[PDB]
Amino acid sequence: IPVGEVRLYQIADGVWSHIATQSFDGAVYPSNGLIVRDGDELLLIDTAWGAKNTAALLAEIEKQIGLPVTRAVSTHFHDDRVGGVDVLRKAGVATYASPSTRRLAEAEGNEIPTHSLEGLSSSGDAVRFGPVELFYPGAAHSTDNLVVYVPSANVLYGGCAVLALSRTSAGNVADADLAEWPTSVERIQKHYPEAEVVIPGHGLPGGLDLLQHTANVVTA
C-alpha cells in the first residue's frame, strides 16, 4: 500500500515473518522474510529490501522481540534479499550467502554478504544452519536461489522461487531459468512433502498447493 513500512507477525513458537514495502520501476510491492529464534539469539532470513527498511526492521525486532540478531542469510542476489546487508554488518550481524550468490551480487552492483556458506553446490544439496535447514532446489527465479525449512515448526520459506496464489505472472524473469523452474519446484515437493505452511517471496502464506500453482504460472 504505502511505501517504506515494515511489520512482523507470529508464525509459530520462535518463528516470525517480516513484511516490507518498496518502490521498484514505478510500482510498489510487498516483500517477505523470516526470523527464527535459536536459544537467546535470532537468525534473520533476507533483508527488508533496502537500507532504510532494514534499519527499521532491526528497531521493530528490538521493540517487539528484544533478542539480538547475530546472523543473517540472503537466499539470492537481488536487491530485495541483499539490499541492507551493509546496515546489518554495521550493527554487528554476521552475514552469509552461497559463493555463487556473492559473485552474482558483485557482478550486479549490489551489497555483498561477508561469509560463504559451505555444502550447497548441486541441486538437491541441504545443510543445517542453526535452527533451520537450507536447500538448493535447482535454478528457478534465478540459478542461485535457496529455500529454507524450520523443522521445529514444519514451516517452509520458499523465497522468490515460490509464487503466492494470487499471482498471474512470474514477474522479472531476466535471470530466471523457466525451463528448469518446474523441475526445481518438484524437488521441493519431494524433499518437504509434509510442510504445512509455505511462505512465498511476496504475498500471503499458503499451503503446499503454492508449489503446483507456481509450476502452472511458470509453464504458461
Ligand X SMILES: O=C(N[C@H](Cc1c[nH]c2ccccc12)C(=O)O)c1nc(Cl)c2ccccc2c1O
Q: Catalogue the active-site residues.
A: 76, 78, 80, 141, 172
Q: Cite the beta strand spans of 13-108 per DSSP E.
A: 15-24, 27-38, 41-45, 69-73, 94-97
Q: Which position among 4, 68, 130, 171 is part of the footprint of ligand X (CB under 6 A)?
A: 171
| Number of other residues whose CB lies within 10 A of the CB of residue 165 | 15
Largest CA distance in the chain: 46
Cα–chain center distance at 186: 19
Cα separation of 149 and 47, whole Å? Answer: 18
Q: Tell me 103's DSSP state.
A: H
Does 76 count as an annotated binding residue? yes
215 touches ligand X (CB under 6 A): no
122 touches ligand X (CB under 6 A): no
Residue 169's binding partner among ligand X, Zn ion, none (Cβ under 5 to 8 angstroms by kind) is: ligand X
67 touches ligand X (CB under 6 A): no
216 touches ligand X (CB under 6 A): no
Residues 95-114, mask of contacts with ligand X (x by CB under 6 A): --------------------
Q: Which helix (H) or strand (E) holds 158?
A: strand 155-159
Q: Which position among 1, 63, 168, 194 is part of the footprint of ligand X (CB under 6 A)?
A: 168
**Sign of the dihedral defined by the CA atoms of residues 141, 15, 44, 155, in that order:** negative
User: Where do contacts with Zn ion occur on this chain (CB under 5 A)?
Assistant: 78, 80, 160, 201
- Applying CB under 6 A, the residues found at the interface with ligand X are 24, 29-30, 164, 166-169, 171-172, 202-203
Annotated binding-site members for Zn(2+): 76, 78, 80, 141, 160, 202
